[PDB]
Design a binder for this molecule. Structure first.
Ligand SMILES: CCCCCCCCCCCCCC(=O)O
Ligand SMILES: CCCCCCCCCCCCCC(=O)O
Ligand SMILES: CCCCCCCCCCCCCC(=O)O
Ligand SMILES: CCCCCCCCCCCCCC(=O)O
Ligand SMILES: CCCCCCCCCCCCCC(=O)O
Ligand SMILES: CCCCCCCCCCCCCC(=O)O
Ligand SMILES: O=C(O)c1cc(I)cc(I)c1O
Length: 581
């Protein structure tokens, strides 16, 4: 490999290459117009071809970091448009590249993307497919500078597949919309997860990150040996550190490597890793990351043998603490792919604590004897929450369920902004739909997965505009205590009911013309405000007031002269209701 560009060009292929250079340039020069990046992609692509034909052609020998930075520094508007960023072209490549990552605005001042009408999109998609998907890839890229490019390209192809299909259908809207909403959520879900892992790494450091990775990789690869798992974690830890820093190339190569490794040692790691290892370069790592858990060996011993009933536990521990605990996790995780990762960590931390007490006691073995017994309540806590909640969800569907949460949390944290409470309660309700569909054994992992994102978003918002110390407590706790902390919140008996507002409970006939989406939002907002004005209201009281309301809306959105039924009958409701409470 004399020419780095020629090599990448050959591994990737024209199409992928061009999409990637586009994304790459958009993530740095987020303020330049589309036509400008397009010209650049062609210049870079014409260059890459020159090197595919002769690796001795000028500059073909230069490294990607150099080629990229040099190209970047040719833009004449640079100085005027990015200013300080232009000062980076005064440094030598080593730091020049570093200077660029520093001026990568994570959340720029660009308008939110508006989804056009299905027909507008389908037609544009037909008249000129390429510039249609590239214009958007550009739009998305400039807005999410740290999103892993290949991951982005992966999303694009699913978008292209949704149009090719749906845009030929009799009723396009009915086909496309549902697909455009699935992707949106996955993209947003995927992004939040990346930002979250990097935050976690930064905040709690490498040790906690590796512990987390040990548990997750063990549940996934129960067959692999601890020596293999440690090796994987180290590599995985070095990978995220590098991808979190923001350097795309570095990140790409580290992942590529790790993916090649895992494949070569496939038999030694996991069985369900075949296909993944067959896919093209760009997809290998993405596939592996989402690989399904392998089956755990049927011939596995009792943990209590090597971690409790054995003597010399303290010796093996003292010799290499983290290694020993690392082992306990590995042994406890691959036997429990049904536990959440933080639950496994919660146990490990408990084992750690007792070993740190017991090993310094008279008779250690007899001290850490009934330690497994201390795990029990830690395991049941989350299991009961799942049974308890999904049972409720099975009764009243998603919407009514979202309502029960609405009443539950508004009573626990009144000070929170009504629109904020509606937002989270709704998302939480979705997690219920998504995870309660699974068999008992996958529910916890599923909920841990969705809750982590929602809980994080919640804390960020509260960080910016604080409202409750409790929420700040829970939010600044260890990532292992975060959720149990929020589950420990109790009804706020300090709160003083807000002043009744007639306006707040006045509804017009427009709610009849609104979409189920709006109706719900409108109603749920009134529901929250109801709890804020009379938080001491029983679930019985609320239920009755809610039913009446149901009728109300119905019996008004089906009557002659709608606008009067909502003014006469409503005043009645608001009076009848006020009295009941
Ligand atoms: C990535 C490829 C982009 C394909 C274009 C999809 C339409 C963009 C709509 C913005 C997303 C949304 O609002 O749901
Ligand atoms: C400009 C060239 C961009 C280089 C990107 C190569 C990324 C290869 C995919 C690696 C992976 O995630 O497995
Ligand atoms: C390979 C490293 C394994 C280390 C095992 C330590 C397990 C303790 C739980 C990890 C969380 C540490 C942060 C905390 O105290 O909450
Ligand atoms: C809303 C859906 C209810 C799910 C219950 C939450 C249980 C979370 C277990 C995760 C953990 O171990 O902290
Ligand atoms: C702001 C409102 C607080 C929401 C916290 C949700 C915590 C989810 C854990 C579920 C539970 O046990 O209540
Ligand atoms: C003083 C109280 C004024 C009465 C206003 C009641 C508003 C409650 C909203 C109930 C909406 C529940 C939605 C539903 O029935 O599906
Ligand atoms: O999720 C990842 O980023 C990831 C990437 C590679 I490459 C291998 C494994 I296992 C992973 O979990």
């Amino acid at each position: 490999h004399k020419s780095e560009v020629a090599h990448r060009f050959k591994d990737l292929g024209e199409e992928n290459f061009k999409a990637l250079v586009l994304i790459a340039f958009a993530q740095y020069l987020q303020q330049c117009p589309f036509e400008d990046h397009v010209k650049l992609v062609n210049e870079v692509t014409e260059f890459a071809k020159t090197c595919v034909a002769d690796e001795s052609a000028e500059n073909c020998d230069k490294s990607l970091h150099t080629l990229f930075g040099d190209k970047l520094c040719t833009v004449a508007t640079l100085r005027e448009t990015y200013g300080e960023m232009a000062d980076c072209c005064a440094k030598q490549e080593p730091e020049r590249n570093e200077c660029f990552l520093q001026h990568k605005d994570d959340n720029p001042n660009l308008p939110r993307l508006v989804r056009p009408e299905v027909d507008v999109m389908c037609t544009a998609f037909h008249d000129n497919e390429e510039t249609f998907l590239k214009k958007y890839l550009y739009e998305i890229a400039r807005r999410h500078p740290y999103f892993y490019a290949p991951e982005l390209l992966f999303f694009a192809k699913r978008y292209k597949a949704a149009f090719t299909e749906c845009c030929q259908a009799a009723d396009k809207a009915a086909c496309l919309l549902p697909k455009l909403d699935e992707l949106r959520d996955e993209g947003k879900a995927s992004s939040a997860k990346q930002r979250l892992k990097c935050a976690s790494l930064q905040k709690f450091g490498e040790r906690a990150f590796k512990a987390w990775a040990v548990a997750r990789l063990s549940q996934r690869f129960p067959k692999a040996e601890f020596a293999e798992v440690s090796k994987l974690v180290t590599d995985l830890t070095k990978v995220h550190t590098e991808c979190c820093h923001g350097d795309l190339l570095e990140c790409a190569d580290d992942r590529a490597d790790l993916a090649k490794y895992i494949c070569e040692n496939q038999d030694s790691i996991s069985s369900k890793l075949k296909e993944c290892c067959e896919k093209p370069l760009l997809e290998k790592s993405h596939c592996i990351a989402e690989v399904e858990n392998d089956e755990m060996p049927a011939d596995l011993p009792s943990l209590a043998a090597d971690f409790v009933e054995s003597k010399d536990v303290c010796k093996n521990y003292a010799e290499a603490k983290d290694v020993f605990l690392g082992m306990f996790l590995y042994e406890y995780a691959r036997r429990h792919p049904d536990y959440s990762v933080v639950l496994l960590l919660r146990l490990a931390k408990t084992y750690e604590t007792t070993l740190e007490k017991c090993c310094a006691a008279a008779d250690p073995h007899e001290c850490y004897a009934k330690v497994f017994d201390e795990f029990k309540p830690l395991v049941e806590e989350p299991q009961n929450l799942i049974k308890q909640n999904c049972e409720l969800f099975e009764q009243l569907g998603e919407y009514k369920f979202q309502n029960a949460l609405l009443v539950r949390y508004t009573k626990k944290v009144p000070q929170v902004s009504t629109p904020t409470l509606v937002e989270v309660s709704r998302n939480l309700g979705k997690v219920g739909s998504k995870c309660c569909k699974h068999p008992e054994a996958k529910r916890m992992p599923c909920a841990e997965d969705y809750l982590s994102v929602v809980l994080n978003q919640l804390c960020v918002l509260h960080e910016k505009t604080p409202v409750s110390d409790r929420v700040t407590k829970c939010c600044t706790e260890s990532l292992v205590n975060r959720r149990p902390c929020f589950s420990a919140l109790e009804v706020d008996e300090t709160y003083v009911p807000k002043e009744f507002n007639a306006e707040t409970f006045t509804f017009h006939a427009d709610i009849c013309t609104l979409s189920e989406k709006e109706r719900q939002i409108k109603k749920q907002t009134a529901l929250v405000e109801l709890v804020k004005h009379k938080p001491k209201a029983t679930k019985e009281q609320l239920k009755a007031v809610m039913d009446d309301f149901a009728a109300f809306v119905e019996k008004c959105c089906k009557a002659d002269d709608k606008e009067t039924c909502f003014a006469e009958e409503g005043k009645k409701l608001v009076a009848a209701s006020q009295a009941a409470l």
